[PDB]
Amino acid sequence: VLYVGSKTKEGVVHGVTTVAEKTKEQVTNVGGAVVTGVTAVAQKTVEGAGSIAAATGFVKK
Amino acid sequence: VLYVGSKTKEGVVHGVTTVAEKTKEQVTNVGGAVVTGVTAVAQKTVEGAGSIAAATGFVKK
Amino acid sequence: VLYVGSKTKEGVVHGVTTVAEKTKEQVTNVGGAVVTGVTAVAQKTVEGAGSIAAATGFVKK
Amino acid sequence: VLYVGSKTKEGVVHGVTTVAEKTKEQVTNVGGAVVTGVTAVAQKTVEGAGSIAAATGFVKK
Amino acid sequence: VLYVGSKTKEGVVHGVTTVAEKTKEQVTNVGGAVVTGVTAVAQKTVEGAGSIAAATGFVKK
Amino acid sequence: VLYVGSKTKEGVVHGVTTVAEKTKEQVTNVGGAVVTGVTAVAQKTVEGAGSIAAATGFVKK
Secondary structure, three states: OEEEOOOOEOOOEEEEEEEOOOEEEOOOOOOOEEEEEEEEEEOOEEOOOOOEEEEEEEEEO | OEEEOOOOEEOOEEEEEEEOOEEEEOOOOOOOEEEEEEEEEEOOEEEOOOOEEEEEEEEEO | OEEEOOOOEEOOEEEEEEEOOEEEEOOOOOOOEEEEEEEEEEOOEEEOOOOEEEEEEEEEO | OEEOOOEEEEOOEEOOOEEOOEEEEOOOOOOOEEEOOEEEEEOOEEOOOOOEEEEEEEEEO | OEEOOOOEEEOOEEOOOEEOOOEEEOOOOOOOEEEOOEEEEEOOEOOOOOOEEEEEEEEEO | OEOOOOEEEEOOEEOOOEEOOEEEEOOOOOOOEEEOOEEEEEOOEEOOOOOEEEEEEEEEO
16 A cells, blocks of 8 residues: 555544433433443454444344 | 655545434334444455445444 | 546535433334444445445345 | 513523634725624613613714 | 413523534624524613614614 | 412523534624624513614624
């Protein structure tokens, strides 16, 4: 890989905004996965054979 | 891979916005996945054979 | 692959917006996979054999 | 005025919102009035004869 | 004036959202009034012989 | 004026949220008024003959 005089963005995440003033969450999980709210996942390169890169709310049995 | 004088951008997520004033959330998940809200996932390169890159609300058995 | 003085976008997600004032959600998942809300998934390359790139609300058996 | 139990609003401004990501303003005012933004104005009563209540962008020669 | 359990709205504004992704304003002004944005006036009572309630972009001579 | 359990809003302004990432103003005003941003104005009563209640970008000669 060669760059000269370049400005490039790879796997970047930015400017994630949320606005509220009243919010209630009543999660009652027992055995799985519950994801609520804001999250940011940003990779550039991952190598694997059966791997999971960006899991949000994942169960595997 | 060669770049000269380029302003490319690759695998970006930006400017995701949610505006509210009243939110209420009730979940009663027992055995799977319940993802609710805002999630921002961005990659450039993934390698695999049985890989999963961006899993959101994923259940596998 | 070579670039000379080019501005380009590859695999991007921008300017996704939701606006509301009242949101009420009562999901009661019993073992499947429920996704509600906003998610932003963006890659450039996905290499696999039986891979999954962007799964949102995915159940597998 | 004899409220004996009621949920009321009397002259309110709520939930004004503006979404953008690129914005440029160029104003070269010389002798007047220029308004280029977001303004929220709300009253209940005004009095008097020569009265101005909401004067967003007003010139009075 | 009486209210014995009545939910009422008296002169309000809401849900006046606006959305864009590229704005550029180049107003040039010398002698008048210019308004080039979003404004929300919500009043209940105004009175007077020469009253002006909601003037947006007003010139008076 | 009498209240025995009325839940009342009388001249309020809430939730005027605006969102951007890139913003640039180039104001070159002379001898006048220029307003380019966010303002919140909320009154209940103003009393007076020659009265101005909510002036935003006002010039009187």
